[PDB]
Write an enzyme that holds these catalytic residues in place. Structure first.
Site, PDB file in Angstrom:
ATOM      1  N   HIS A  40       4.251   1.770  22.606  1.00 31.53           N
ATOM      2  CA  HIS A  40       4.154   1.738  20.833  1.00 31.53           C
ATOM      3  C   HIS A  40       4.537   2.401  19.745  1.00 31.53           C
ATOM      4  O   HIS A  40       3.704   2.295  19.057  1.00 31.53           O
ATOM      5  CB  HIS A  40       2.041   1.339  20.764  1.00 31.53           C
ATOM      6  CG  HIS A  40       1.359   2.073  20.465  1.00 31.53           C
ATOM      7  ND1 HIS A  40       0.616   2.616  21.634  1.00 31.53           N
ATOM      8  CD2 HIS A  40       0.627   2.438  19.415  1.00 31.53           C
ATOM      9  CE1 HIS A  40      -0.625   3.566  21.171  1.00 31.53           C
ATOM     10  NE2 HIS A  40      -0.490   3.672  19.801  1.00 31.53           N
ATOM     11  N   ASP A  84       2.113   1.748  28.518  1.00 26.91           N
ATOM     12  CA  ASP A  84       2.155   1.553  27.303  1.00 26.91           C
ATOM     13  C   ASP A  84       3.039   3.051  27.604  1.00 26.91           C
ATOM     14  O   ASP A  84       1.879   3.512  27.253  1.00 26.91           O
ATOM     15  CB  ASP A  84       1.071   1.534  26.881  1.00 26.91           C
ATOM     16  CG  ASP A  84       1.078   1.771  25.384  1.00 26.91           C
ATOM     17  OD1 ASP A  84       2.365   2.311  24.507  1.00 26.91           O
ATOM     18  OD2 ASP A  84      -0.013   1.853  25.143  1.00 26.91           O
ATOM     19  N   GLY A 175      -3.638   7.696  15.237  1.00 25.30           N
ATOM     20  CA  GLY A 175      -2.851   9.038  14.894  1.00 25.30           C
ATOM     21  C   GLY A 175      -2.700  10.116  16.350  1.00 25.30           C
ATOM     22  O   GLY A 175      -2.381  10.420  16.001  1.00 25.30           O
ATOM     23  N   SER A 177      -2.513   8.370  19.250  1.00 24.69           N
ATOM     24  CA  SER A 177      -1.836   7.936  20.119  1.00 24.69           C
ATOM     25  C   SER A 177      -0.732   8.448  20.738  1.00 24.69           C
ATOM     26  O   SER A 177      -0.106   9.057  20.213  1.00 24.69           O
ATOM     27  CB  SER A 177      -1.011   6.412  19.148  1.00 24.69           C
ATOM     28  OG  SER A 177      -2.321   6.022  18.770  1.00 24.69           O
ATOM     29  N   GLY A 178      -0.471   8.224  22.532  1.00 25.52           N
ATOM     30  CA  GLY A 178       0.404   8.485  22.861  1.00 25.52           C
ATOM     31  C   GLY A 178       0.038  10.305  23.268  1.00 25.52           C
ATOM     32  O   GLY A 178       0.736  10.782  24.021  1.00 25.52           O
TER      33      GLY A 178
HETATM   34 ZN   LIG Z   1      -2.158   3.487  18.603  1.00 25.18          ZN
END
Ligand SMILES: [Zn+2]
Ligand SMILES: [Ca+2]
Length: 223
Positions: A40, A84, A175, A177-178
């Site tokens: 995402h 994801d 912020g 995420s990942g």
């Molecule tokens: Zn996210």
């Protein structure tokens, strides 16, 4: 990250910041040429920044390298966020040193109860917006699937796990995420989603990396 602490400059040497003119997601360096992040976080035009502590100040240990290709997981579903995970290849190989190191992929999955380290430059307020310039860290345990599934009925798949505190107060946030969730020296998760941040009975949900090791290995070896 909400309820976390300042890591320290370059204490999470495998942490990356994905930038497209500004920081928008975190990632993990798995070897000199590859980074794993969340699907995402996919964007066209990504520059990977390694050896970062303050993302607004060039303090001397950074390496800014553009991505040559991005590969989103073949079965990523943006509506449910199942699978994801995404791989990013660097145009040039990063120079690994004390401040820039890769993290190992797991040999097996981690058990509920295991303590992990989550990091990133995401929001630090549950109710409010405050974006930090330096890396924040959070130690949080993996929760049992039962408490994860009760919090998110019909939304958790076998490719996800929850980590955090049901009382709330501590959690990853947008912020972040990942970014990485490292437990016992292995990359076990990727910051994926949650219900707001640090809310009571709404822990964060992470992509379960141990289920993708063969896909990761095969994909990087063929690209
Ligand atoms: Zn996210
Ligand atoms: Ca910097």
């Amino acid at each position: 990250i909400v309820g976390g602490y300042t890591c320290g400059a370059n204490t999470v040497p495998y942490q990356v910041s994905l930038n497209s003119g500004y920081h928008f997601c975190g990632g993990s360096l798995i070897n000199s040429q590859w980074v794993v992040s969340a699907a995402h976080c996919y964007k066209s035009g990504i520059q990977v920044r390694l050896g970062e502590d303050n993302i607004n100040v060039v303090e001397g240990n950074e390496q800014f390298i553009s991505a040559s290709k991005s590969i989103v997981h073949p079965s990523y579903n943006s509506n449910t966020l199942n699978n994801d995970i995404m791989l990013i290849k660097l145009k040039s190989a990063a120079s690994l040193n004390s401040r820039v190191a890769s993290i190992s992929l797991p040999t097996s999955c981690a058990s509920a109860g295991t303590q992990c380290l989550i990091s990133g430059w995401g929001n630090t307020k549950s109710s409010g917006t405050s974006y930090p310039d330096v890396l924040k860290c959070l130690k949080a345990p993996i929760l049992s699937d039962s408490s994860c599934k009760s919090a998110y009925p019909g939304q958790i798949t076998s490719n996800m796990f929850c980590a955090g505190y049901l009382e709330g107060g501590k959690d990853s946030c947008q912020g972040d995420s990942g970014g990485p969730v490292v437990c016992s020296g292995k990359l076990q998760g990727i910051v994926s989603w949650g219900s707001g941040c640090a809310q009571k009975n709404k822990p964060g949900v992470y992509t379960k990396v141990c289920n993708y090791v063969s896909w990761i290995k095969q994909t990087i070896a063929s690209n």
